[PDB]
Design an enzyme around this catalytic site. Structure first.
Site, short mmCIF file in Angstrom:
data_model
loop_
_atom_site.label_atom_id
_atom_site.label_comp_id
_atom_site.label_asym_id
_atom_site.label_seq_id
_atom_site.Cartn_x
_atom_site.Cartn_y
_atom_site.Cartn_z
N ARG A 38 -32.66 -11.93 -33.29
CA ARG A 38 -32.36 -11.10 -32.14
C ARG A 38 -32.39 -9.61 -32.49
NH1 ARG A 38 -27.13 -11.37 -28.13
NH2 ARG A 38 -27.33 -9.21 -27.36
N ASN A 44 -17.86 -8.48 -35.67
CA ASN A 44 -18.38 -9.69 -35.03
C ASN A 44 -19.88 -9.77 -34.86
OD1 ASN A 44 -18.62 -7.91 -32.90
ND2 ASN A 44 -17.66 -9.27 -31.38
N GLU A 76 -18.19 1.17 -26.52
CA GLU A 76 -18.07 -0.16 -25.92
C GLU A 76 -16.87 -0.83 -26.58
OE1 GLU A 76 -19.79 -4.37 -27.40
OE2 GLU A 76 -18.30 -3.65 -25.94
N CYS A 106 -16.30 -9.20 -27.16
CA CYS A 106 -15.86 -8.20 -26.18
C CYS A 106 -16.30 -8.59 -24.77
CB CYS A 106 -16.43 -6.83 -26.56
SG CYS A 106 -15.62 -6.00 -27.95
#
Ligand code: NAP
Ligand code: NAP
Lengths: 475, 480, 476, 476
Positions: A104, A155, A251, A285
């Site tokens: 990704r 993460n 974020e 998140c």
């Protein structure tokens, strides 16, 4: 193990100070390696180097910079298995969505290069405004800001690092890159490949160590031209407070509501709720952390969900467990303390209030109320709370009562109302009849309220790491 | 003569505190009127009254929003006489230029409105990205941020206020508006119009008070969603540092350089400079404040400029003079200290150092060095320093050595080189063979380094007052 | 009073050199309303040339001046909406409030067109954006007018569909040779009387009149013409595309818009929309519901609903705002009858209408209509609405796409996700979900596929069709 | 040797007529291979086969379409050594530049696909126009046109085919493809890789045969939804005349002017002009074909030009000579005619007017006048005229008097001046201090007047092979 150096001006070095920080695997407790703990002075060296490398870097033609992102993405992909293994150990991410993290990332990198390559300029004539003279024209291009401070969480140690780095680099900026400590080794091996891909000296600078010690020195530094940060809200608010006179993108935490209505497909609602709440054991998140279900369908949904929570595997990341152990004791006791407030206040435990050190069983909770902490606070663990609601009006009010505002889901066969309910929600993105998510990566990604500042996703990332430059000709 | 009230929640009211602030004309010192001084009670009331009104305002049809703007602009045009002249007495701006301020604002408002209607959405299919879903579509749209704090300077009382207000309201934010105390009676009248045009209750809140007393509560107040500020560079710094977790737009000072090469039209070049440096006595953010001239033409440029400056008229705004009194005696004193330092350090006085009160003869200074303060510090007054340079490279260097980087002007017959120079300048906007200016307002406007933060203009102001609002749907794949 | 119209060429209001004219009558009354000049092949030539000569001086004008012309032309139109209004009411037998309503709409179109051109922006591109390209090269992309635009409008909207083509032409720096329909030239001229008085420069707007059958092909094939915009019948539109050469041709033609009505549809709305959509201006609209497809399950109570609302439509005079007013002429009415008489004979159910007194046809509803009937395919352009009963959506799509037309469609169902999906299978320009078909709001792109049209319209897409890419490459 | 079969519905076939067309290598007059001459009925199968296939192809997710383009390009790259050789022998294109053509084709396809991946729709709201309802919303995507007819010329038998095919398919059209007879072998091989890439059956059809024979039927067939054509002006006008109710895009001939002024850097100019004029022995639509030079600096330019010209290599395409034999004898004679006409009217021969069969030397001609044919007629051969011009106005005027309007070059130190001279020139693209060219391929490319219709380039092709599909939702 992996005793790692850091990149400054094209060479791999240690702290002059000679001191490291130890990095273990959160699942097994086993030694993975170390990272240098850099001084403020070594952080001054990073920043100054990048500053000087940018002046040479901004001048490179646009296709040269994209060719680099390309060469870096190719390299990341053939290292997916290995960078993949590292991530899963370092931050306990199930093997496959950890190998899938590297792939990704490579994809985000190329798409980012591609989108850079078609940022065009625009021309404006003076007289396109009353008064404005017939004979002046504005040429508006896009200019890099300077040096990007990019700070990433544990993460997504590669994905959240590269998604900041790549739009910064391809647009003529240079980067000083601060990975979360747990995550650094994966960040570093990602940067390894950027440099084997021939990155020029100083364009990418890695700083490691004591995020509590060097943190502010980075954020307050005069050589820093813009900051990208993904993390907790607390650290998020301190950066906003302590940075000044620079663009700053954040974020942060989420408490993504799922509004399930009368006429929802309850099978699909259940599948999507679980999948969103329990992916990487709640440590996201963007994830469902809250369910507001109408009373009439409640029992059906809750059984539908409980059935799937019982299906979920819980165990080793090397096994591709659904639930793996959370990041540390700090987190595990915080989660446990949230279940606690819930239980001793009337909440019904539907499943798994179990704890094997850091391995926390998938906890499902019914009959949750405003009075309870789990209703509001981002747990960052595998616990889901169900709140019972009279109608959509109650679901919206309680949605908007959160200080968070990242993403929201609406589940209803009635598409028209789902869209109009969404308008009333105060979040970045609404998802009708599906779980919340950051990807696919070309979609804008933002939170509001205490969830964030600025906008990400491929093209919004490029747009925010540049400014308009105008040349006004006079024909 | 004008004891103004303030608009809170649809009602033109006073402060419950009872206290006012007198505003006299800088041209003389005669009293124009007064303005409420509000407490932390009446400010929080405004913010509450604005936060709540935006829930209904944000759900209004966008076409109704723009009509309020069309109606408000027209009303301002009707009132260019009474309101334009309030400006010239209040900030002592030339009469014709002042009325012209009120003119430009209506245009700005109407053009802001027009752009609001073309704010289209976008759609994205999921598989436009590798491994993404063919059966997902993002409806991307814009959304208002909420309550906008609009702070404006005495500079352009009406122009620079409505330039923040109009894009904010049209996109469906509400506004808490803090004018400069001097220039407030001007902004207030500007608002009287918006309310006359029919503004819903609470969408525009007008706050007034000493600024140094009530400004920090305002800036840090958790009910504000976005700050847009134009003023002194010191106060900008304050705001950026005291705000957090919101968008912040700042437009701050400038030391705009003019670079004049050998191969330049020395008449046009000279005329542009005198037009741009001495407009409103240099009390503009965007203004040529220092000239880097090549010494091969230095003698010729300095002469051209010495001539035109001598042709500027000195007097009162009522009389439309070119050079008008500066804002107050504080400013007057700070400018004189800039001249004295230059002259004590061996600069050449070419034109009037004289001053009459707050009225200050336009000042031309030659053979200015990097040693002199006036080479760097923003005078915000009718003073212009010529710095003799040897080539383009030295002119870039010094230009770039400033903490400012708003706008520049490069004068040469060679246009390819001027574009090549322009690329090397750390500014927002480069002007080839023309002075620096904010206008025309559909041009992007931004300063870099200490000169500003974020972007403006018609379109870019609109984007800055809004955020992406994404809705993601499933699409059916088979019926057949 | 008799308005004896003249036409405008090179800034002057002129008559025909021959002196010969075409008389124009009120279709709903019979009364003479005035007349128009009838022009030679060589008067067409004087218009076109006089427009080529003008265009060279008009493209140079700054944009804000062209925009200020549109703005002042709109103002006078609005200011005249009552007189122009009443004239259209007479000349094309249209209800009074929608006559005025046409003029207001027009002045809004012009004004939105003006502000939209004001916002066309250039692009710059670097060479090395494409692989191999030079980093030294920079393209400045702008938009250049095409030159001379032939704008042809119908009787439907003699002002609105005239200006929808003129205003975007002029504002971008083209000049216009404007061919209105004979029936409607009066109003079309009172529209250009308004552009005249706003200050339009000579040769910018040339009016030519005379029967399309006479002067039409000459205009279409003329080498002085650089682009054509046409709104009318499928026949004439096809002919024009066949005869035009080497030029952009934009056409908006006839339509047979279906309304597809699935079983789960809200039936009081579906009928409400279909009636408003089929019978407005008595069916004489390119965009109109011209056939209904309804699932058997709900076929009976829908057709009952539709029938109720049909019987409340007021019929008669334009001055009293009748929902149904008299069609355009007797030839027009005779085509409609032949379509009703075919259906009746071929086995269809009459539910209402088939009443008439000359020009004024009463609203006509037809149930049990089949593919064997002509009225299921052929654009009547009259106040008749056939209903075709269908097993399911797959058959409705199939029967929709079998038509030569493809302008617009309507899908009525509670299942939005499915309506979208069904629409994607309809070969049309615009699919309306739970609403009637319509051209606007005017900023929405408007187009037909198949025989419904060619090229795009709507405010902005119109602007782009009347310009072309101009490209300057610099080597920095 | 290469006896080509053509592609229909996924099968590789010869003609039912049983007839073939022999293709010969223009450098040596030797047999290379052959192609089938299809019937009108085989052309009909082709159109029908692609019409069917389109219905399934338009349905595929964007990423699947994009993915095929990529596989196609990787295979063409893999195959550049053999396809380039085939281009070299089929059209006498210098060896390396033929291979480079294939490399340019892969780049164009990949970029095309990438651009297609970035086509986003837009949402419009009702009250964005005055009166419009606040409660409805238009979703505007791009929908494929249907079956695209792509007609390619001889001199870029692959690049100029693919530039049409690639964006047709990716946006969900299918393609019927008529390559030039001379060059049909290259195309077939270009297409072989596309099938090898896994193109579903019928999305790409190849029709071979005489354009004189099968061209008209093809252009007039109602199964055709769009035509894109590159070739001569005479065929282009014939196509445009005969086609109807469909979009048509033409890239035709040009007579690209180079304007050289007092302050011109004459070294760079000479260089740019000889490179631009004589590539592929002048057998290019965009190429400097005439020079307007200020007589003040004329003698100097022509000297510089002459040095470079006499330095161009003349010989076989296998040896990468700059100047290769022209396409056929018809060509060689039309060129001879133009030189003769010029000399027989006074012009100065400064470099070779010398032949060996179709192998012509680069001919340079000074003292050319607006009375010689070579001042105006596109030679399509290695011939360059120079005209003495008083000032820029003469240069401008002489440029515009030509029927063609493809590109232009301006040489001068004064870049402001070169911009305003650019403005007054009636062409597609003006190049400052550089030769004319099509590339880089993302740049808009168009001819005006007799030079073109509509627009090409990567993204503008995508737009020209689609149209707006609107879907109006209703949220009330
Ligand atoms: O009215 P409607 O809906 O029924 O549409 P229509 O008859 O097809 O006419 C539409 C427009 O085209 C004109 N026209 C008629 N024949 C033409 C031709 N052969 N070439 C070019 N223009 C022609 C008409 O003028 P006329 O009013 O003279 O037919 C009218 O202005
Ligand atoms: O090749 P070029 O550069 O020399 O230019 P050209 O002669 O105009 O040829 C361009 C293309 O048009 C085709 N063509 C020829 N006659 C046609 C017709 N009547 N209708 C439609 N297409 C036709 C040609 O096929 P052919 O090569 O078979 O003539 C060729 O593919």
């Amino acid at each position: 193990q992996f005793n790692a150096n850091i990149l400054r001006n094209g060479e791999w070095v240690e702290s002059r100070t000679g001191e490291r920080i130890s990095i273990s695997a959160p699942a097994s407790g086993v030694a993975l390696g170390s990272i240098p703990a850099l001084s403020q002075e070594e952080v001054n060296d990073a920043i100054q180097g990048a500053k000087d490398a940018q002046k040479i870097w901004k001048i490179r033609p646009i296709h040269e910079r994209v060719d680099l992102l390309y060469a870096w993405a190719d390299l990341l992909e053939e290292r997916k298995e290995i960078i993949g293994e590292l991530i899963m150990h370092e931050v306990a991410k199930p093997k496959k969505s950890a190998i899938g993290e590297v792939s990704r990332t490579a994809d985000i990198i190329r798409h980012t290069a591609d989108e850079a390559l078609r940022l065009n300029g625009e021309t404006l004539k003076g007289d396109q405004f009353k008064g404005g003279s017939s004979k002046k024209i504005a040429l508006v291009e896009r200019e890099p800001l300077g040096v990007v401070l990019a700070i990433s969480p544990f993460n997504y140690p590669v994905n959240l690092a590269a998604a900041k780095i790549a739009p910064a680099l391809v647009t003529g900026n240079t980067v000083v890159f601060k990975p979360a400590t747990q995550g650094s080794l994966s960040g570093i091996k990602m940067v390894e490949a950027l440099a084997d891909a021939g990155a020029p000296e100083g364009i990418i600078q890695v700083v490691t160590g004591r995020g509590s010690v060097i943190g502010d020195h980075l954020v307050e530094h005069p050589g820093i031209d813009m900051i990208t940060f993904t993390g907790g809200t607390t650290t998020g608010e301190r950066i906003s407070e302590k940075a000044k006179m620079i663009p700053v993108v954040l974020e942060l935490g989420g408490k993504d509501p799922a509004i399930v209505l009368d006429d929802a497909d309850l099978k699909l609602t259940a599948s999507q709720i679980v999948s969103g709440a329990f992916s990487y054991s709640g440590q996201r998140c963007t994830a469902i952390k809250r369910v507001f279900v109408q009373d009439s369908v409640a029992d059906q949904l809750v059984a539908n969900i409980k059935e799937l929570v019982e299906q979920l595997t819980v165990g080793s990341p090397e096994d591709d467990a659904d639930i793996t152990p959370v990041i540390d004791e700090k987190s595990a006791a915080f989660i446990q303390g949230l279940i606690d407030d819930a239980l001793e206040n009337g909440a019904t435990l539907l499943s798994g209030n179990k704890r094997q050190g850091n391995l926390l069983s998938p906890t499902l909770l019914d009959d949750v109320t405003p009075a309870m902490r789990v209703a509001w606070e981002e747990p960052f663990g595998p616990v889901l709370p169900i709140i019972r609601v009279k109608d959509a009006n109650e679901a919206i009010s309680l949605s908007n009562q959160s200080d968070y505002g990242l993403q929201a889901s609406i589940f209803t066969k009635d598409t028209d109302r789902a869209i109009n309910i969404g308008k009333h929600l105060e979040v970045g993105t609404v998802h009708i009849n599906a779980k919340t998510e950051r990807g696919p990566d070309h979609f804008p990604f933002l939170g509001v309220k205490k969830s964030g500042l600025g906008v990400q996703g491929i093209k919004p990332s490029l747009l925010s790491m540049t400014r308009e430059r105008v040349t006004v000709l006079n024909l």
